[PDB]
Structure 1
Amino acid sequence: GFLGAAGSTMGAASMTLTVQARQLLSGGIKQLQARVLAVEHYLKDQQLLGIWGCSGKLICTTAVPWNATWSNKTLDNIWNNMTWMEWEKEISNYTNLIYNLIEESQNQQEKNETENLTLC
């Protein structure tokens, strides 16, 4: 069910990403504004995945190393012993920092893809 994995560990919860993804689009003037706003939030997330180079994916790996200062827990204590709510709270102060690093990495990747040849 929708958010059924909310209390599950991150590992188990990562297996239901399509359940939450579908509910972002399907789930007087004030209601038209509400629909436009829901569309704007969806596109905001799609544009953010776009600049990160993660379009079309549910799970997208990057080339940004994980910094032990953000969290020094082992993977077993993250994926099997902690939920996503707890994780998002634990690294909340670094979320924007991580997002900026992802964008920077993609920008470097773009330079390595679009400027390899003269006018090509």
Structure 2
Amino acid sequence: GFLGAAGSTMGAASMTLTVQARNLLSWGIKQLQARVLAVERYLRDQQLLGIWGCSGKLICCTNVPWNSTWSNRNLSEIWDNMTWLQWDKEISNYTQIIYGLLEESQNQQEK
């Protein structure tokens, strides 16, 4: 199911990432406006993955080291003992930094 296992730990929930990826694209003017928005959101995410070294992968590895300043926990405290909802909150202040670094990490590979 969609968001099934949302409360499961990180790494457990990820066993089925296709479910939340394949279901993003599914007056009456609101239906047209909704179709346009769904497309825009989808493309913004695909462009973002594509501005990084990522393409068709759901688990893309990139050449950016992890900073202890973003989060410093045992690996078992990331991929167990916690779900994605808390993790997203935990590092919400660094997302824009990581994304900028990912973009540059790829520019450095254009050789």
Same-fold status (TM-score > 0.5): yes
CA drift of 1:85 comes to: 0.6
In the aligned structure 2, how far is the partner of 1:99 from the partner of 1:84?
Answer: 18
CA drift of 1:36 comes to: 0.7
2:58 paired with 1:29: no
CA drift of 1:16 comes to: 1.3
Give deviations 1:63-105, integer Å, cap 9, x for gaps. Answer: 1000010000111001011100100000000000000000010
Moved beyond 3 Å, runs of 4+: none
Q: What secondary structure, in the 3-state scheme, does the structure 1 residue paired with 2:93 have?
A: helix
CA drift of 1:108 comes to: 0.6
Written as runs of structure 1 = structure 2, the 5 A alignment for 1:1-120 is 1-26=1-26, 28-110=28-110, 112=111
CA drift of 1:43 comes to: 0.5
CA drift of 1:29 comes to: 1.6
Letter aligned with residue 68 of structure 2? A
Whose radius of gyration is greater, 1 or 2? Answer: 1
Letter aligned with residue 11 of structure 1? G
Q: What secondary structure, in the 3-state scheme, does the structure 1 residue paired with 2:60 have?
A: strand
In the aligned structure 2, how far is the partner of 1:15 from the partner of 1:77?
Answer: 18
Identity %: 83
Unpaired segments ≥5 residues, structure 2: none
Letter aligned with residue 24 of structure 1? L
TM-score (norm 2): 0.96
Letter aligned with residue 58 of structure 1? L
- Residues 5 and 16 in structure 1, CA contact (< 8 A), matched pair in contact too: no
Aligned-residue Cα RMSD (Å) equals 0.7
In the aligned structure 1, how far is the partner of 2:107 from the partner of 2:34?
Answer: 34
- Count of residue pairs brought into register by the alignment: 110
CA drift of 1:53 comes to: 1.7
Give deviations 1:19-51, integer Å, cap 9, x for gaps. Answer: 10011011x222101001101100100000000
